[PDB]
């Protein structure tokens, strides 16, 4: 809460900016090569372990 | 149609005739209130498969 207290900036919480970029990572923007597509390819999903595990924890799905 | 005939009471498939009995069968249960109030909480529960059944067998979160 210090880093809160510290810093002007707080990014918002909650998993709700990993679905923002997954999508804002919006593909072929790697038009370079494919494998920097595969290195946002799966970097996009790695963002959204945090919003899955919580609805994973939580109930429902994951994925819903 | 000679169910219907038979008995000309349709009734609503499904949960609506089975978690419906189910209340009255516990409240049976609970109202004797002895040991064959377990069999009716059995039984009361044993209702509630189809529909969780129905619910395993749509895709959703049955006990929710």
Same mark, same amino acid.
């Given at each position: 809460? !210090?880093?809160?207290? =510290? =810093?002007?900036?707080?990014? %918002?919480?909650?998993?709700?900016?990993?679905?923002?970029?997954?999508?804002?990572?919006? +593909?072929? +923007? %790697?038009?370079? !090569? $494919?494998?920097? &597509?595969?290195?946002?390819?799966?970097?996009? =999903?790695?963002?959204? @372990? @945090? %919003? !899955?595990?919580?609805?994973?924890?939580? $109930?429902? =799905?994951? &994925?819903? | 149609?000679?169910?219907?005939?038979?008995?000309?009471?349709?009734?609503?498939?499904?949960? #609506?005739?089975?978690? #419906?009995?189910?209340?009255?069968? *516990?409240? /049976?249960? /609970?109202?004797? *209130?002895?040991?064959?109030?377990?069999?009716?909480?059995?039984?009361?529960?044993?209702?509630?498969?189809?529909?969780?059944?129905?619910?395993?067998?749509?895709?959703?979160? *049955?006990?929710?």
């Amino acid at each position: 809460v !210090k880093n809160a207290i =510290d =810093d002007g900036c707080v990014v %918002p919480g909650a998993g709700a900016v990993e679905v923002a970029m997954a999508e804002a990572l919006i +593909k072929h +923007k %790697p038009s370079v !090569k $494919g494998r920097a &597509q595969l290195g946002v390819q799966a970097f996009a =999903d790695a963002l959204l @372990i @945090i %919003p !899955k595990v919580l609805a994973q924890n939580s $109930g429902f =799905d994951l &994925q819903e | 149609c000679r169910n219907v005939l038979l008995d000309p009471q349709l009734v609503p498939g499904g949960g #609506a005739s089975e978690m #419906a009995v189910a209340h009255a069968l *516990t409240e /049976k249960s /609970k109202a004797m *209130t002895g040991v064959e109030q377990w069999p009716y909480r059995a039984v009361a529960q044993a209702l509630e498969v189809i529909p969780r059944t129905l619910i395993q067998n749509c895709g959703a979160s *049955t006990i929710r």
